[PDB]
């Protein structure tokens, strides 16, 4: 029925960890066991906003819920997640994460995150595979899901030593992969155990947190993770060009988690061999302005923009570039008419080549303090 009048209840609330309502969209694929409580079919996507949907659509005994708690401890975002059904064979568990179009009109595994478009007008901007990115065939298809979506995917090095991770990441020369190696243990509030989380959804909520506050152009490296204890293995950052473990992991382009607990990230690079798009803040502004070309083409095709197309797209593109100069995301912005236009009948009939140059804000990596001990002001003080 119902109840009238106020009601006081003996209950259990576990120590509120509210965060900021972020704006970026996160894709996630991890494994759980379906039951009558978990009210979601495996290979269908569902957007989640708070922990009430990670306890009702998916079970609390899961591994999505280990990673949805990872985002919601850090930044309240919109996670579009699918479920991979539980397998036992270590290849068949990862081969169901990949999947394909084995169904009639449905993609199953990681590919089901392509249904973020045409369903909510909210594509995933981040792609997370917690723990499964240690396998190569998952991580290579994170690249194949990033090229179709313009969404940088967060990888996961193995929980073993550094040479198991540096020699793992030698086969990646892809612009959009971002690897976080050291696994994070976090003490659970029920089972009295430091749960060895895979530590790739901890960085996913951090990217949602930096976009909501400090913006996308700030490199999301020295920002503090909350709701977290130490890593599964300790790293350190000391100075003097030695074999210290943080310098050993940046030079092979892996993010690291540095201090007392799982405080901060440390990677500023992405897994690109091409040193132009080495910073993650450059690839996320490139893949943001390439989306404004798409919405600047969709807006310049539904209204019959025939004779004034290239003027409608380019000025509408510079309406977005002056926004980035306004927000501090770029320093230079210039949309150039390239001199590779050969003849007037040749260029006006086809192939008008224009450029977009922008100097992204470089994140302060390696400040340098050249320090002295002098005898200059010893005379002035004593006399």
């Amino acid at each position: 029925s119902f109840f009238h009048g106020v009601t006081v209840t003996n209950v259990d609330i576990g120590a509120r960890t509210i965060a900021l309502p972020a704006s970026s969209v996160i894709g996630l694929c991890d494994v759980f066991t379906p039951g009558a409580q978990a009210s979601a079919k495996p290979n269908v996507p569902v957007l989640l906003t708070s922990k009430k949907d990670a306890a009702a659509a998916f079970g609390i005994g899961s591994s999505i819920y280990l990673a949805c708690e990872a985002i919601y401890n850090r930044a309240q975002a919109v996670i579009v997640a699918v479920g991979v059904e539980t397998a036992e064979t270590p290849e068949a568990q990862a081969s169901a994460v990949i999947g394909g179009i084995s169904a009639a009109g449905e993609r199953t595994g990681l590919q089901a995150l392509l249904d973020g478009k045409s369903r909510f007008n909210a594509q995933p901007r981040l792609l997370v595979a917690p723990g499964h990115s240690a396998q190569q065939a998952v991580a290579t298809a994170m690249d194949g899901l990033a090229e179709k979506l313009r969404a940088i995917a967060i990888l996961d090095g193995p929980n073993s030593t550094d040479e198991a991770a540096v020699a793992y990441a030698k086969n990646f020369g892809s612009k959009r992969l971002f690897m976080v190696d050291p696994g994070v243990q976090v003490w659970d509030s029920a089972t009295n155990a430091a749960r060895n989380a895979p530590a790739s959804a901890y960085a996913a909520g951090l990217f949602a947190w930096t976009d909501a506050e400090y913006g996308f152009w700030s490199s999301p490296s020295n920002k503090e993770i909350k709701g977290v204890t130490g890593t599964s293995r300790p790293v350190e950052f000391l100075d003097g060009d030695e074999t210290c473990r943080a310098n050993l992991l940046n030079n092979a382009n892996i993010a690291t988690i540095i201090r007392d607990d799982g405080y901060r990230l440390w990677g500023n690079r992405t897994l690109s061999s091409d040193s132009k798009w080495a910073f993650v803040t450059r690839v996320r502004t490139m893949d943001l302005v390439m989306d404004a070309i798409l919405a600047g083409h969709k807006w310049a095709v539904d209204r019959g923009i025939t004779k004034t197309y290239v003027k409608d797209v380019t000025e509408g593109l510079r309406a977005f570039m002056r926004d980035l100069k306004n927000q501090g995301a770029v320093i230079n912005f210039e949309v150039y008419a390239d001199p590779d236009l050969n003849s007037a009948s040749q260029l006006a009939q086809g192939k008008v080549y224009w450029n977009i140059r922008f100097t992204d804000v470089p994140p302060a990596e390696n400040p340098n303090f050249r320090v002295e001990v002098t005898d200059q002001w010893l005379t002035e003080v004593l006399d």
Binding site: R303, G304, K311, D312, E315, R322, N326
Partner: protein, 166 residues
């Protein structure tokens, strides 16, 4: 030789108002001057302070719904519009002038409706972004925010933003 204008086109968001835009007025660009006479002078010199505001006033003569719906939006610089013009002088060399602008459509004025005349609605946009290209290349590029007052390619506030850190 003087330049008689021949063709006139107005866009609002891409929709061709080529035809029924009988009158259009670009914003007069006015330097914020100040009659300044200091100690060692008698006549006042005038010093720039920036520009003053920019209103562009076109007047379409129909019940549009394609220009009416940009009044009172929650965001300024949402109405943009692109003017296109064509002055024709000096042996048929019609110079293509465009004047693309942007800003809040600050006033929609329906006139007297005396039951039988034309419509002649009136409009006024508080222009923020203003870009005037005469014969392809740039003449006036006025972005108020970010301080991008640029005359024929060179940015006259390049020395200012280095001083202000912008």
């Amino acid at each position: 030789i003087p330049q008689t204008l021949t063709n006139t086109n107005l866009f609002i968001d891409g929709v061709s108002f080529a035809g029924d835009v009988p009158s259009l007025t670009l914003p007069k660009l006015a330097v914020k001057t100040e009659q300044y006479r200091a100690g060692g002078m008698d006549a006042p010199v005038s010093i720039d302070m920036g520009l003053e505001a920019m209103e562009a006033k076109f007047s379409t003569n129909g019940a549009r719904r394609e220009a009416l719906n940009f009044f009172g939006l929650a965001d300024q610089s949402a109405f943009n519009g692109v003017f296109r013009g064509s002055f024709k002088g000096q042996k048929g060399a019609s110079v293509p002038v465009v004047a693309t602008l942007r800003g809040l459509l600050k006033e929609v004025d329906p006139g007297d409706w005396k039951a039988g005349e034309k419509a002649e609605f009136k409009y006024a946009v508080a222009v923020s972004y203003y870009k005037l290209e005469v014969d392809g290349r740039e003449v006036y590029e006025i972005d108020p925010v970010n301080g991008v007052r640029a005359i024929n390619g060179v940015d006259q506030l390049a020395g200012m933003r280095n001083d202000l850190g912008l």
